[PDB]
Amino acid sequence: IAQARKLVEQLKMEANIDRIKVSKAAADLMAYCEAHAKEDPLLTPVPASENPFR
Amino acid sequence: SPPCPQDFSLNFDRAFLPALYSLLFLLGLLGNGAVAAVLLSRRTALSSTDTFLLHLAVADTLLVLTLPLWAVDAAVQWVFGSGLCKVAGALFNINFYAGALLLACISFDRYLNIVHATQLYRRGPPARVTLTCLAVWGLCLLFALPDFIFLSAHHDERLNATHCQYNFPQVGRTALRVLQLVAGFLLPLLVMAYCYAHILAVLLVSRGQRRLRAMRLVVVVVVAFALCWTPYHLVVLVDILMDLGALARNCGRESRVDVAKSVTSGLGYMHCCLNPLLYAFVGVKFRERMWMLLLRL
Amino acid sequence: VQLVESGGGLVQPGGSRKLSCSASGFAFSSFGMHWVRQAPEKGLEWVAYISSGSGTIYYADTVKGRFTISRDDPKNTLFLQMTSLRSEDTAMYYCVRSIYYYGSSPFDFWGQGTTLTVSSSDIVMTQATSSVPVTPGESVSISCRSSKSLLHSNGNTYLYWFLQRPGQSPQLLIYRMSNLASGVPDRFSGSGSGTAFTLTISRLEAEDVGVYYCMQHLEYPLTFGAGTKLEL
Amino acid sequence: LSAEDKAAVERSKMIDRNLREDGEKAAREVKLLLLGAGESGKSTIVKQMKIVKTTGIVETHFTFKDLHFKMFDVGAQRSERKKWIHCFEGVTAIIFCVALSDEMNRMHESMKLFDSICNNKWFTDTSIILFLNKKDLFEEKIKKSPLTICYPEYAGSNTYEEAAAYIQCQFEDLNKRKDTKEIYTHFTCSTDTKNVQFVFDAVTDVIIKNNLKDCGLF
Amino acid sequence: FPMFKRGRCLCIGPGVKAVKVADIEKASIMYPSNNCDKIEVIITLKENKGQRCLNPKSKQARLIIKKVERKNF
Amino acid sequence: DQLRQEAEQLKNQIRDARKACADATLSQITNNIDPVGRIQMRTRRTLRGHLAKIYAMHWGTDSRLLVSASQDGKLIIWDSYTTNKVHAIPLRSSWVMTCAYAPSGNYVACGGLDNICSIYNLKTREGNVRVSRELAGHTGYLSCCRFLDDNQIVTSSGDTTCALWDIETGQQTTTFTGHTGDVMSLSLAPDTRLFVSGACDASAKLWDVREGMCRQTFTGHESDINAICFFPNGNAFATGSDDATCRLFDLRADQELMTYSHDNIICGITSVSFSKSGRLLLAGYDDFNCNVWDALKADRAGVLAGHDNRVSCLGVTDDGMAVATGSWDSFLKIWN
Ligand SMILES: CC(C)CCC[C@@H](C)[C@H]1CC[C@H]2[C@@H]3CC=C4C[C@@H](O)CC[C@]4(C)[C@H]3CC[C@]12C
Ligand SMILES: CC(C)CCC[C@@H](C)[C@H]1CC[C@H]2[C@@H]3CC=C4C[C@@H](O)CC[C@]4(C)[C@H]3CC[C@]12C
Structure with missing residues (x-):
């Protein structure tokens, strides 16, 4: 019985989240991926001069 | 009354040897190169028998690669000077001796794996395979040295052309043929017979389902080697004896012994080209490795 | 140890x-x-x-x-x-x-x-200064100079600074011209470039006196150069 | 080139040779995976060993005729068996223990576990050494109660050896890969060296088959 | 094995005395080789119906070989 | 009974609440940004020396040294620029299934089928690596472990619980319970304020390091979850599972954002990591190769093939230079 009571407490506490629209989160992810685009050596390979691996 | 002309021998030579040599060249390169390529890519974690198989494939590849020069020689004449004579002869003898000794070494390694399974499992030296291979190659070089130095492109006055042949007298020829016969047929055959007899006994005592295929493969290997390399050595022994022991000297004997020597040398070359078929492609592990190389890449 | x-x-x-x-x-x-x-x-x-x-x-x-x-x-x-x-x-x-x-x-x-x-060395490193009079309230700079560029193609400058106190054995102060050895007070520091290097002590104490040596570890002869003495 | 990177490379090479030596010394070991259901005679098998801090896996070393055997007991995991079984993909053999004296349908659980282990996708080409423990209690119970209770389709007498053979073959025919792997069966006896000799013979046979596959035959 | 081909002794047995003059259409005087060590002399007959060997034991073989070895070389 | 109804109505209310936030989708928002080109990567280094399946690996914080653990009872520390072995630690238990490298660089960790997390000290005066601690108290195999501040470590085990330890005292500071199946992986947040765990109950949970409480629970997978990784922003994560699909979830929206699946992939996923900017998603599969997906488009941008067996571990350096992948053929490969 205590398992059910604990689960109900957990669900009650989990159902009190200040959510956010999916579009806003998508826009934030897009903005972060765009801002740090130049600093991604895998996305935009750097020349062989400053590549520590040859 | 005539100078017992060995005409039919040379005409048969020019008629048959070029095509046979070319076909054997093509098949030997194809098979042995495929085997060496499959084994060389995944060279790491090779078993001992796989290392010996790679060395045997290399030796047979070199032999069949040297073969087309003798194809050309049989075609018309020898037009390559004396340096090529020496190099090609040395390569041929090295490859033949290496093939025989590596077959004997494969047989011995299989004997150690199957009969003395536990002792080799818990007391097996790690660096004996490379030592055995290096000893084999060094002994082959030491055997090919007399060929490596006495060879010459001699214009045969008895013949009507120039051929790559030897310079020591006929007693040296008898000695070299005896050494070839012994160290290329007798010792390898004795080692194979002993080791595979013990392997057959062990496989007969035990129980299972792959032991039948193992015994079949062992018998096929022994029979294939014996049938392929026996007639040539009998023909060589008959030639040696007729040179000294059983005279019977007439044109018929010479013509028959020469054509027999040619066809049996063809048989031996066929065995050298065919070794990969019954030493590599009959094992499931090698086929899995080959497919992993082929399909996945 | x-x-x-x-x-x-x-x-x-x-x-x-x-x-x-x-x-x-x-x-x-x-x-x-x-x-x-x-x-x-x-x-x-x-x-x-x-x-x-x-x-x-x-x-x-x-x-x-x-x-x-x-x-x-x-x-x-x-x-x-x-x-x-x-x-x-x-x-x-x-x-x-x-x-x-x-x-x-x-x-x-x-x-x-x-x-x-x-009884009766293609790299030479010079520490021109031989003695320095100090008081335990200031900062001291010791300069070392090389005959070759100690900087290697992999970005590592191979210079070591050792300190020998009177009556004792030398102890590692700095390795590779910038790194402090284990159990060394933070007041010590090192810097330099290629051929001219400097050891800096911010605030000395009574135990900072002795002879300072600058060794190279680029070519293996491993020359040392006569040290610089700090006293008083 | 390198200034004191040569000393780093030399240290790396020494590390390499030490690793290679350790691998060589560890490749001359026999590793067996010991499985069973509910302590069904595992103890009386491990009692032939002659050599709470760690509750995950149990190691067991012994030596017979100069051959070194390592046995792993994993009976105290209680986790999903499919999440860690692939760690034991390369063991030489699986020693599976089954208690013959069975009463709450435990034989069905043992058969289910054996069916899962034998036909597992990782243990293809891995042999199984079956140990039918507790034959005296089986004698007594079969004297009292027949085998029909556990297996309703028993059309034989209450004779001990024929029913034991029935149980043995009904375990052994669960092997779906009748040609890829083999099953070795034994009835554990009070004699000390018989079990170890049986395991030694089975391991010798499986080593010979492995060498047959490796050395190019088969 | 292609390196072991060798020129066997062409004439088996001593040369024959059935010599008839005015049959010089081809005559080969050839040195002892490394395989068969005996200088041998072959002379053909008319219409190439037979090529017969001349043994050096006979005097005319000696004469012909000596003048060939002194002249042609 | 009187409480299962309460749980069911709470679950339905939660589903409805997170259904109203899905005004749009990440795919139809990213539909108008340039796709990344064909990502082609080269194998710069191959690290040999392990003699058994490599089960775990971890990069150093300087992104030059990495630690790898194999099933032959060995830890090896490699200098990736030169492929030199810095250290080779022999473990007491050969059955190691995870490893970690401390952010400071002074310690490493291991765990596995012996239910013990061993902490090893690299910087000793004696000149050799010696075991510093053995944290015990789990009742199942250790599946992951992550150093937190060089003095506390988070571990996850097959007893369906996670734990936070104190290395000095060797006792569990905190215990995280709430999962139902084995916990197979965890990932620390960049600020080390939260972490996420993925379990065999096909669910992920977001735990708070303090207060030992489960913030949110994420579902959507069909089978066991084997890998997890935070987005570099720290506001999203990605999970790989056995149904041959990856999922990107967002913390704030408290629901699934995107799925990465293909019809030609049927094998499960063993490892997951992100790129430096978060634009690429690296995933290791059982079909012997790795896949590089566009994190904003959900289409494969590259394939990293060259391993002869299942790819078991995968990591990306802190500066994004290279990607290290290790597989069951006992080799690690550095790709760039
Ligand atoms: C393989 C090694 C270790 C063994 C000994 C090598 C010696 C004996 C061999 C190897 C290659 C050979 C040379 C290869 C080809 C020629 C050209 C020929 O017109 C004259 C002999 C000459 C010059 C050979 C002389 C002997 C030789 C130098
Ligand atoms: C000029 C001739 C007569 C003398 C040289 C002999 C040659 C053909 C022989 C002697 C030693 C032999 C090598 C010995 C060892 C190896 C390593 C093995 O992994 C592949 C084959 C290989 C590379 C052999 C190839 C053939 C070889 C090079």
């Missing part, structure tokens, strides 16, 4: 000796070992080096041929068998451990040294 030396004493010229260095408290098999020499009232001078596993052995030019370094790992001992002793070999001998991997600190621990008395 300690290195203990034995085998010193008075020797006639032309004789032979064997110095022993017993190591306790660390994995002796993993450390390369050096014998370093200090002549009376003179600077340090590298003598010999034996690798880990006894793989590579290096000797100084002035001691090559008549010296032999060796190690016995089961007993954790390092031997220097020296022969044909001249009158220029009278000195104190130190036994130094040095382990090499990525980010290690070689030359970190020095033995006490044993005294041996005898």
Whole structure:
């Protein structure tokens, strides 16, 4: 019985989240991926001069 | 009354040897190169028998690669000077001796794996395979040295052309043929017979389902080697004896012994080209490795 | 961890000796070992080096041929068998451990040294200053100069700073021109470029006096250069 | 080139040779995976060993005729068997223990576990050494109660040896890969060396078959 | 094996004395080789109906070989 | 009974609440940004020396040294620029299934089928690596472990619980319970304020390091979850599972954002990591190769093939230079 009571407490506490629209989160992810685009050596390979691996 | 002309021998030579040599060249390169390529890519974690198989494939590849020069020689004449004579002869003898000794070494390694399974499992030296291979190659070089130095492109006055042949007298020829016969047929055959007899006994005592295929493969290997390399050595022994022991000297004997020597040398070359078929492609592990190389890449 | 030396004493010229260095408290098999020499009232001078596993052995030019370094790992001992002793070999001998991997600190621990008395190097590094009068409230700069660019193609400058207090054995202060050794106060710092290097002490104390040496570890002769003295 | 990177490379090479030596010394070991259901005679098998801090896996070393055997007991995991079984993909053999004296349908659980282990996708080409423990209690119970209770389709008498053979073959025919792998069966006896000799013989046979596959035959 | 081909002794047995003059259409005087060590002399007959060997034991073989070895070389 | 109804109505209310936030989708928002080109990567280094399946690996914080653990009872520390072995630690238990490298660089960790997390100290005065601690108290195999501040470590085990330890005292500071199946992986947040765990109950949970409480629970997978990784922003994460699909979830929206699946992939996923900017998603599969997906488009941008067996571990350096992948053929490969 205590398992059910604990689960109900957990669900009650989990159902009190200040959510956010999916579009806003998508826009934030897009903005972060765009801002740090130049600093991604895998996305935009750097020349062989400053590549520590040859 | 005539100078017992060995005409039919040379005409048969020019008629048959070029095509046979070319076909054997093509098949030997194809098979042995495929085997060496499959084994060389995944060279790491090779078993001992796989290392010996790679060395045997290399030796047979070199032999069949040297073969087309003798194809050309049989075609018309020898037009390559004396340096090529020496190099090609040395390569041929090295490859033949290496093939025989590596077959004997494969047989011995299989004997150690199957009969003395536990002792080799818990007391097996790690660096004996490379030592055995290096000893084999060094002994082959030491055997090919007399060929490596006495060879010459001699214009045969008895013949009507120039051929790559030897310079020591006929007693040296008898000695070299005896050494070839012994160290290329007798010792390898004795080692194979002993080791595979013990392997057959062990496989007969035990129980299972792959032991039948193992015994079949062992018998096929022994029979294939014996049938392929026996007639040539009998023909060589008959030639040696007729040179000294059983005279019977007439044109018929010479013509028959020469054509027999040619066809049996063809048989031996066929065995050298065919070794990969019954030493590599009959094992499931090698086929899995080959497919992993082929399909996945 | 300690290195203990034995085998010193008075020797006639032309004789032979064997110095022993017993190591306790660390994995002796993993450390390369050096014998370093200090002549009376003179600077340090590298003598010999034996690798880990006894793989590579290096000797100084002035001691090559008549010296032999060796190690016995089961007993954790390092031997220097020296022969044909001249009158220029009278000195104190130190036994130094040095382990090499990525980010290690070689030359970190020095033995006490044993005294041996005898009766009657393409990179040279210069420490022009010989003595400096100081008070325990200021900052001191010690300059070292090389005859070659100690900077290597892999971005590492191979300069080491050691400190020898009066009556003791030198201790590693800085390795590779920038890194402080373990258990060294933060007041010490090092910098430089290629050929000119500087050691900086922010606020000295009574225990900051002594002789400072700048060794190179680029080419293996490993020259030292006469140190700079700080007193008062 | 390298200034004191040569010393780093030399240290790396020494590390390499030490690793190679350790691998060689560890390749001359026999590793067996010991499995069973509910302590069904595992103890009386491990009792032939002659050589709470760690509750995850149990190691067992012994030596017979100069051959070194390592046995792993994993009976105290209680986790999903499919999440860690692939760690034991390369063991030489699986020693599976089954209690013959069975009463709450435990034989069905043992058969289910054996069916899962034998036909597992990782243990193809891995042999199984079956140990039917507790034959005296089986004698007593079969004297009292027949085998029909556990297996309703028993059309034989209450004779001990024929029912034991029935149980043995009904375990052994669960092997779906009748040609890829083999099953060795034994009835554990009070004699000390018989079990170890049986395991030694089975391991010798499986080593010979492995060498047959490796050395190019088969 | 292609390196072991050799020129066997062409004439088996001593040369025959059935010599008839005015049959010089081809005559080969050839040195002892490394395989068969005996200088041999072959002379053909008319219409190439037979090529017969001349043994050096006979005097005319000696004469012909000596003048060939002194002249042609 | 009187409480299962309460749980069911709470679950339905939660589903409805997170259904109203899905005004749009990430795919139809990213539909108008340039796709990344064909990502072609080269194998710069191959690290040999392991003699058994490599089960875990972890990069150093300087992104030059990495630690790898194999099933032959060995830890190896490699200098990736030169492929030199810095250290080789022999473990007491050969059955190691995870490893970690401390952010400071002074310690490493291991765990596995012996239910013990061993902490090893690299910087010793004796010149050799010696075991510093053995944290015990789990009742199942250790599946992951992550150093937190060089003095506390988070671990996850097959007893369906996670734990936070104190290395000095060796006792569990905190215990995280709430999962139902084995916990197979965890990932620390960049600020080390939260972490996420993925379990065999096909669910992920977001735990708070303090207060030992489960913030949110994420579902959507069909089978066991084997890998997890935070987005570099720290506001999203990605999970790989056995149904041959990856999922990107967002913390704030408290629901699934995107799925990465293909019709030609049927094998499960063993490892997951992100790129430096978060634009690429690296995933290791059982079909012997790795896949590089566009994190904003959900289409494969590259394939990293060259391993002869299942790819078991995968990591990206802190500066994004290279990607290290290790597989069951006992080799690690550095790709760039
Ligand atoms: C393989 C090694 C270790 C064994 C010894 C090598 C010696 C004996 C061999 C190897 C290659 C050979 C040379 C290869 C080809 C020619 C050209 C020929 O017109 C004259 C002989 C000459 C010059 C050979 C002389 C002997 C030789 C130098
Ligand atoms: C000029 C001739 C007569 C003398 C040289 C002999 C040659 C053909 C022989 C002698 C030693 C032999 C090598 C010995 C060992 C190896 C390593 C193995 O992994 C592949 C084959 C290989 C590379 C062999 C190839 C053939 C070889 C090079």
